[PDB]
Amino acid sequence: SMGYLMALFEDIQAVIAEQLNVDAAQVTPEAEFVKDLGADSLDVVELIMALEEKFGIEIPDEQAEKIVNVGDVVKYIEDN
Amino acid sequence: SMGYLMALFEDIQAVIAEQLNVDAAQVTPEAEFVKDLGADSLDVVELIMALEEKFGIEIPDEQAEKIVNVGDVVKYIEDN
Amino acid sequence: MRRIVVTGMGMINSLGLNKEDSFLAIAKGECGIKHIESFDASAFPVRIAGEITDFDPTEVMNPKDVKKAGRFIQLALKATREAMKDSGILDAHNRCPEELANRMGVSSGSGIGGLGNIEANSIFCFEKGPRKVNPFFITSALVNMIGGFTSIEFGIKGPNLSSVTACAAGTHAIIEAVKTILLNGADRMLVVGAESTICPVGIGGFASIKALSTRNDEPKKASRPFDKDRNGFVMGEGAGALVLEEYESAKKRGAKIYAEFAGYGESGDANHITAPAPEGEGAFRAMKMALEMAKVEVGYVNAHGTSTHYNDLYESIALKNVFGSKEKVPPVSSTAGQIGHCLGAAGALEAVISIMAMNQGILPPTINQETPDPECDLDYIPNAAREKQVDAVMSNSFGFGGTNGVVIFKKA
Amino acid sequence: MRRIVVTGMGMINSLGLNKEDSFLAIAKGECGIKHIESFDASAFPVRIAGEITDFDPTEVMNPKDVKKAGRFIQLALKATREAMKDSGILDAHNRCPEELANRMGVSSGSGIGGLGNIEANSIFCFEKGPRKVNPFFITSALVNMIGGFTSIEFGIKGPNLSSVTACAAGTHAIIEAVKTILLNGADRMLVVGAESTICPVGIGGFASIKALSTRNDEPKKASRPFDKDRNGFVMGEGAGALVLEEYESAKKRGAKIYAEFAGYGESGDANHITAPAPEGEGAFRAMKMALEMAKVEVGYVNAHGTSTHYNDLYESIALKNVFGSKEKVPPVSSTAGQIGHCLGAAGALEAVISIMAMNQGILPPTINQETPDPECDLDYIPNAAREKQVDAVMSNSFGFGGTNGVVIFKKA
Ligand SMILES: *P(=O)(O)OCC(C)(C)[C@H](O)C(=O)NCCC(=O)NCCS
Ligand SMILES: *P(=O)(O)OCC(C)(C)[C@H](O)C(=O)NCCC(=O)NCCS
């Protein structure tokens, strides 16, 4: 439900927060990994791996290419 | 049985020959590894391990330490 | 300072077991990339590599000692034996003369050495305990065992040095040997870069960072330096070897002289752990310091050119910047299309290739040039070798950690 | 030729997090060897090691980056930060000044670097396939990533070089730095040796060749260089770091001067892959070459002295032969009893230790001397530190592959 969606978003915020070493404050749906979260090629792909571990997922390589803001990842995990 | 013992001797001879690129000619009970077979500190400890691996056994370190000739090694394995 | 010449050469790679066969195939634009078959890569995202399929270790080693050497050391023994024999230095027993032995050393290069051996023994230990760790593990795996095994095989007792600067290790190995001879620490040095890491964790390591081409459906078009459709490097295996010798001592011996060492440059980016500095700034400085030290006209550049996006782009920018303009860049080719990028061995292989190109007036092409990249606008000798005599050659190598090495050899 | 001074030092090992705390404990004859607890060693024939239990990686790098660096690199980033600050060279941002950055490089050393990381990702790949290989695997494990992370951390852009000559790597990293300054490739060089291999495949590898002491009940008596009851080395982890500067540069900027570099020697045995040359023949040549080059009276020798039968004996033989007789050998000690043998890092740790001994007139002892070995009949400064002034110190390192390196520093 809406509560389930909130729980999923908070879990995503936790992972994106620990990996990039940033507060859950800055990881908002409109936050860009490279511009707004201080990440790089190696950090994004490693964040994506960690999610495919925290949320049983196996994002295929083509979907990971189109990932600009945390919102992309959250909506993909939603469609799960 | 005597046949079983002879088969074990054949297997041990083959192993010592391969691990030390030596023909079955020199692998005699009185053949010492360093003088007669051309081994070294590393080759010997490696021979003893593939013995434990091929014969699914486990030579304790004390008996392995006293090993000087093929005859001694085979007699130890038989006593097993 | 002291004068340094090349008096013997050897190389093995996915297009040949010696430098003659290999260079011929490379100059003809042949490609040694194939499907992986040294392990089961069927579930891998990258399934292609520059594997050497005709190599028999028992031809270079007593069959009993093949088990003591990682595959990279076996390839190093193949290449160094060829170069040593080529040098005429060896006596009737194929060893260095005892009165020359203390002043001949060995400079070895590799990125990681025996990775497949570390992987295998890691797994033995995890699955069945430390009693399943093979006793020949450590000495089969260490990078410096290239110099260990070779110094023992040839009886060379001079400085025994190893370079582990990633994909620049082969070139840095040349430079450390040059420095050693310049400072009077040796009169001769055997140089060898060697690498063999076509194994599950090695391929997995590089695919995990998205650095490898994924054209598994077309292995011989996957490696395409400077092409617009490049999409990552292809891992190759091999070894290159050179004998370096102080000039007076070489002429006294009656040595053959392939080339003369002219200059080198080394720098670090201090930027990123895998990506190059903006505008290839560290590459620029290393090339500038080599060119200023050589004081010659370079007529051919064997580029690092691994077929990733970043290197090909920033290497081209740095080349332009160092020679002044696109027109002032000498002919440039990367031979990584032909044999893959061979990591720690690439610089040694590519110094042999560069020198042979000089010797025979044949500049090998960059192959698989099908779509010009606007950002990659140099003369890459596309697709077919160019018959052109040159009087000096430059070879570039860059590695993770932003470490750069450049060498120039001149005609002699 | 050009003159070179040490202007900054740092070190971290099983007896201290800084050079001050570490040397004091070493000169007091304390012992950092403990029972392995980094991994479950309960099933292992060897359950002791020189572990650092007080080290926090988040003090030298921000928490996000800790996962990008092998433990040996975390240790290197601590030791170099100490040395770089100690040197007074950093600007207001803790970075090398920009106008000096191109001319200051880094020379790093390790025997194998991130072994635990190779081991872990090898197992990941073998249990879950290649997609479970972490992206940060490769750059966390390569030996040259010491110079990679350190050069980015301090913004030094000079030659970025890495030695991987097994247990002599830390001494060769010093020498390659010297060579680079002597040839005017740099005016300053950060030097760092770093090793951290206390992991299952690391301990099992050295156990399976019977190299390690199995005195598990007594970790503080296990490591006993030159003693008659020595039965193998004890693996230690740590890093040592030096800043080298051309002499006039250091004066002009008002540098602290710990020592001046005096001489070095490098050789290979070309005898055996693990065993030393008979009579320490290769060690003898490296030691003679360093003494002939330093031309100073050495008052103290820090021996390799790993607590093995061959090293201690063949190193003792070589020392007599080079100084002529056992009576002419200066006071010798190995500090491997105190902190274990730290493999590739040892050469760097033992150069810091040796210079501090000189600085303070305090020669640290070889601990655990209980039973004289009649064949090891030198003055090993047994058990208690000796107050003695020396004007020059010499440090020895030897590695698998028969590779030898020796350095001599002299009083400023
Ligand atoms: P990120 O934008 O840093 O991307 C990660 C990759 C793996 C693409 C990395 O930057 C990269 O390509 N590194 C090496 C570039 C190259 O070709 N270097 C030559 C040494 S292998
Ligand atoms: P062999 O008696 O050579 O047995 C192999 C062993 C493991 C004993 C090996 O040779 C050895 O321990 N050598 C001692 C040499 C040494 O300690 N070198 C310093 C590098 S750790």
Automatic annotation (TrEMBL), chains A, B:
Keywords: Cytoplasm, Fatty acid biosynthesis, Fatty acid metabolism, Lipid biosynthesis, Lipid metabolism, Phosphopantetheine, Phosphoprotein. GO terms for cellular component: cytosol; membrane. (R)-4'-phosphopantetheine binds at S41. 4'-phosphopantetheine is transferred from CoA to a specific serine of apo-ACP by AcpS. This modification is essential for activity because fatty acids are bound in thioester linkage to the sulfhydryl of the prosthetic group. Pathway: Lipid metabolism; fatty acid biosynthesis. It holds the Pfam family PP-binding. InterPro entries: ACP (IPR003231), ACP-like_sf (IPR036736), PKS_PP-bd (IPR020806), PP-bd_ACP (IPR009081), Ppantetheine_attach_site (IPR006162). It comes from the Bacteria. GO terms for biological process: Kdo2-lipid A biosynthetic process; lipid A biosynthetic process. It is found in: Cytoplasm. Residues 6-80 form the Carrier domain. The keyword RNA-binding does not apply. GO terms for molecular function: acyl binding; acyl carrier activity; phosphopantetheine binding. The keyword Amino-acid biosynthesis does not apply. The modification O-(pantetheine 4'-phosphoryl)serine is found at S41. Its main location: cytoplasm. NCBIfam families: acyl_carrier, PRK00982.1-2, PRK00982.1-4, PRK00982.1-5. Carrier of the growing fatty acid chain in fatty acid biosynthesis. Belongs to the acyl carrier protein (ACP) family. This is Acyl carrier protein. It comes from Helicobacter pylori. The gene is acpP.
